[PDB]
C-alpha cells in the first residue's frame, strides 16, 4: 500500500481524481514475459479521439496483497477526462497505461470495468502528508473486489476505501461506442495502403524478385512452395492484430531518434504469434557486417515472412527465399502526429 | 574495389593458374551476382605475374613493422631473387 | 544429387500478377469475421459486468424494503 | 619518517611498456596498503562494469594516494602520501590543465576516457588505469555535472516520447574551460553507489526545503520587478508560480533566525559531503617546468 | 539467369554460396502446418 499514496500526492497537477489498483501476476504474463517491466497514463477517447496530455504513474512489484486469494503487483489509474464537472462518465472508454521500467507492454483498461468495480466495492512547523492518515485505519477485506477484466478475460483487483470528498463524489457518479474500434481499423487502413503500395510496386515493375538479400535456394522451391503461393502475403493483413509492438509504427516514432531498421516477423502459415518489432543495429562497432549477418539470418528464416520498415519513408517486404518487394511509406502527417502523441511527446 | 594479394607457392605456372582459379572461385560469382557484365571487357577477373623465386625451406619468416604509432604484421621473404614476368589473366 | 539455385540479383520469383487481388479480399472477409468475434465476446464481457451494476442497484433499492 | 615504499612486480615487465612508464613518471596512483593487483584503479574500474565514477571514488578517497616516480623491470618504487610533507607533483595528463589559478588541487576518477589514463601490462595479470589530477573548480564542476547527468539521463530514458536524447549530451556535454571544451566519458546507468549519493543528497534537499527564509522571496520578487540583472538572466523576466504561492504569508524575523541556524548547519553538512576525495593545498606551482609543491590538507 | 551448385561453407564476401546462406525449409512440417491452418481458416469461415 505504498504506490497509491505515492501517486495520489504526485498527480495533483494534471489529474483532479486518482483511482488505485492492483494488477495480478497472471494477467500481464502474456504482456511481458520473465518479469521484465517494473508508468505513463494517456486515456484516449471513444468518439472524441483527438489528443490528450500525458500523466506519469508510479508503481511497485514483488509486494504482496493483503488478500491471499492472489499474490501480485501494484498499479493505479488516474482519471482526469471529464470536462468541468466530473459527474459525467464516458461509457465504453479506454484508458491506456504504459507500464515499464526501461516502454515495453501496454495496459488498456475501461471506465466501466473500473467504476462498476469501484461502486461494487463501496519556531515553525512541518506539515504532515494528509492522505496517508486514513489508509492505515481501514485495513479491511471489503475494500478490494474482483472485477472481470474485459480486454483479457481475467480478474483485476481494485482497491478503494472511503477516503474523502474526491472518492466520495466518485461512488455517486453515473451518466448516459467505438473506443476499441478506431485503433484496429486505423491499423487496417495503413496496412491496406501499404499492401496497395506493394501491389502497385509489383505492377509497375515486372512482377519479379530482385532478391536484395542473398540466399541460396533449392531447385524445388517452386514445388515445396506452390505456384504463386502468396497465401501468407494474402492473410498478412488479418495477422497484424498488434501495431504498437509491430515495427511498422516503430519507424515513425524512430524519426525523432538514419541507417536504422526495424523488422516484424510473421510465420509461414500460422505457427504462432512470433514476434513484433525487433532491432537491426548500425551504430555500435558490431558494424555493417554484423547487420549483414543478422540480415541474411533474417532472410534464411525459411518459415517466417518478414516486413521491413525504414525511417526515411520506405517499406520493404521480405519473402522467405530472399525475395524482396519494394514499397513506399508515405502517410499523412496527421496520423504520424497521432501515433507519436499516442506513444509520447512530439 | 580491386585488391592486391600476394602468393607463395612451390608449383609451376600451369598449376598456379588452376589453383588460383579454384582459390578465387567465390569471388568470381560474387562479382557475377552483384554486377552483371554488361559490356565485353568486365569479364577479365584480374591477372598474375611471377615476381621471382627464393628458398623454399627458409621462406617467409614473420616479423613486425613499426611506424611511430602502430604495428602491422608483416612477412619477410628472405634472400629473394627478383624476376618479373608479364601478366597472365586469371579468368 | 540435389541442385540449388545460385544467389544472384537476377533470380526471379515465380511471377504472380493475378494471385494478389483476390488475396486481400479474402483477408478482409477473414479479419471482419475475427473482429466481429472479438467485439461479440467483448460485448459479452461488457454485458456481464454491466448486469452486476443493476444487481448492486437492486440490493441498494432493497434497503427500503428492509424497514417496510 | 619513511616515504619510500618499494613494490615488486612478479614477472618481467616487457620493454615496450617501460618506455611509457618512463613517460608516466611523477603521476599519482592509488595504493592498497606488497602485491601487484589493485595498485592502481583497474580492480574497481574494469571494462566489464559501467564506469560509475563513485565506487572508484570510494576507493580513491578511502585509500591513501601514492606518487609513482621510478619504474624499473621487476621492481618499481612508490611513495605514499602522509600529511605534513609537501609532495612534488607533475601535471603529466593528456587533457591539459594549466595551474594558472594556483589553487587547491583535486583528484578524480578517469572521467576523461579510458585510453588517456590506462597502461597495458602484459607481464602479469594486472592492468593499470590512472586517477585524474585537475584543479578544484573544474573538479567540482565536473563532479556536479556527472551527478546531474546520471540523475537526468535516467529520467530522459524514463520518457516514452524521448524525442531528444542528444539534448543533454550536447548541452551538459563537455566541460567548462576558457582554454577549450574537453569532452568527457559518460555512463548510461548510474550504478548503485551513485544512486546512494543522490539518495543522501535528496535527503538533505527535502530536509532543507522545509525551511526557507521568507524575506529572501520578497527580495527576488522586488529585483525581478526591478531591472533584470545579468545574474537574473535565468528567469528571463518571469516570476515562478511556486514562489508566488509560498508568499501568501508575511515577513517575520523570529522564525528567520532558527531557519538560518539550521541552514548553516545543513550547508556545512552538505559541504562535508562535497569535500569528498583527498585534497591538496598548493604552494607556488612553478610554471616553466610543470611541477608543484603540494601537501595533504 | 541463375546457376546451379551443390555446396560450400563459410564465406566473407556476401554473394557466395555457403551453408549459412541456405534457407532452412522442412517440406513435410510446412505442409502439415499449412493443412491444419487451412482447416482452422475453414472453421473461421463459418463463425459469424
PDB file of C-alpha atoms in Angstrom, chain A residues 41-53 78 80-81 90-97 106-111 178-180 182-183 186 244 337-339 341-343:
ATOM      1  CA  UNK A  41      -1.131   7.495 -18.306  1.00  0.00           C
ATOM      2  CA  UNK A  42      -2.791   8.569 -21.552  1.00  0.00           C
ATOM      3  CA  UNK A  43      -6.552   7.989 -21.667  1.00  0.00           C
ATOM      4  CA  UNK A  44      -7.824   8.361 -25.216  1.00  0.00           C
ATOM      5  CA  UNK A  45     -11.479   8.852 -26.013  1.00  0.00           C
ATOM      6  CA  UNK A  46     -14.307   6.886 -27.601  1.00  0.00           C
ATOM      7  CA  UNK A  47     -15.679   9.364 -30.139  1.00  0.00           C
ATOM      8  CA  UNK A  48     -13.696  12.488 -29.181  1.00  0.00           C
ATOM      9  CA  UNK A  49     -10.435  10.873 -30.383  1.00  0.00           C
ATOM     10  CA  UNK A  50      -8.110  13.948 -30.750  1.00  0.00           C
ATOM     11  CA  UNK A  51      -5.081  14.036 -28.472  1.00  0.00           C
ATOM     12  CA  UNK A  52      -4.664  14.476 -24.721  1.00  0.00           C
ATOM     13  CA  UNK A  53      -1.904  15.348 -22.284  1.00  0.00           C
ATOM     14  CA  UNK A  78      -5.559   8.341 -12.927  1.00  0.00           C
ATOM     15  CA  UNK A  80      -8.778  13.378 -15.472  1.00  0.00           C
ATOM     16  CA  UNK A  81     -11.005  13.202 -18.509  1.00  0.00           C
ATOM     17  CA  UNK A  90     -17.713   8.424 -20.634  1.00  0.00           C
ATOM     18  CA  UNK A  91     -19.034   4.901 -21.244  1.00  0.00           C
ATOM     19  CA  UNK A  92     -17.192   2.280 -23.321  1.00  0.00           C
ATOM     20  CA  UNK A  93     -13.988   4.214 -22.807  1.00  0.00           C
ATOM     21  CA  UNK A  94     -10.366   3.087 -22.932  1.00  0.00           C
ATOM     22  CA  UNK A  95      -7.637   4.318 -20.598  1.00  0.00           C
ATOM     23  CA  UNK A  96      -4.127   3.390 -21.727  1.00  0.00           C
ATOM     24  CA  UNK A  97      -1.248   2.770 -19.357  1.00  0.00           C
ATOM     25  CA  UNK A 106       0.729  -1.590 -22.841  1.00  0.00           C
ATOM     26  CA  UNK A 107      -2.234  -1.633 -20.491  1.00  0.00           C
ATOM     27  CA  UNK A 108      -5.712  -0.971 -21.863  1.00  0.00           C
ATOM     28  CA  UNK A 109      -8.394  -0.510 -19.221  1.00  0.00           C
ATOM     29  CA  UNK A 110     -12.058   0.531 -19.272  1.00  0.00           C
ATOM     30  CA  UNK A 111     -14.047   3.099 -17.338  1.00  0.00           C
ATOM     31  CA  UNK A 178     -16.038   2.963 -30.590  1.00  0.00           C
ATOM     32  CA  UNK A 179     -13.058   3.228 -28.225  1.00  0.00           C
ATOM     33  CA  UNK A 180     -11.573  -0.196 -29.147  1.00  0.00           C
ATOM     34  CA  UNK A 182     -10.744   3.059 -34.063  1.00  0.00           C
ATOM     35  CA  UNK A 183      -7.183   1.838 -33.484  1.00  0.00           C
ATOM     36  CA  UNK A 186      -6.726   2.547 -38.373  1.00  0.00           C
ATOM     37  CA  UNK A 244       2.492  -0.547 -31.432  1.00  0.00           C
ATOM     38  CA  UNK A 337       1.376  13.083 -35.109  1.00  0.00           C
ATOM     39  CA  UNK A 338      -1.476  10.961 -33.760  1.00  0.00           C
ATOM     40  CA  UNK A 339       0.901   7.996 -33.412  1.00  0.00           C
ATOM     41  CA  UNK A 341       1.268  11.540 -29.399  1.00  0.00           C
ATOM     42  CA  UNK A 342      -0.270   8.128 -28.728  1.00  0.00           C
ATOM     43  CA  UNK A 343       3.122   6.922 -27.552  1.00  0.00           C
TER      44      UNK A 343
END
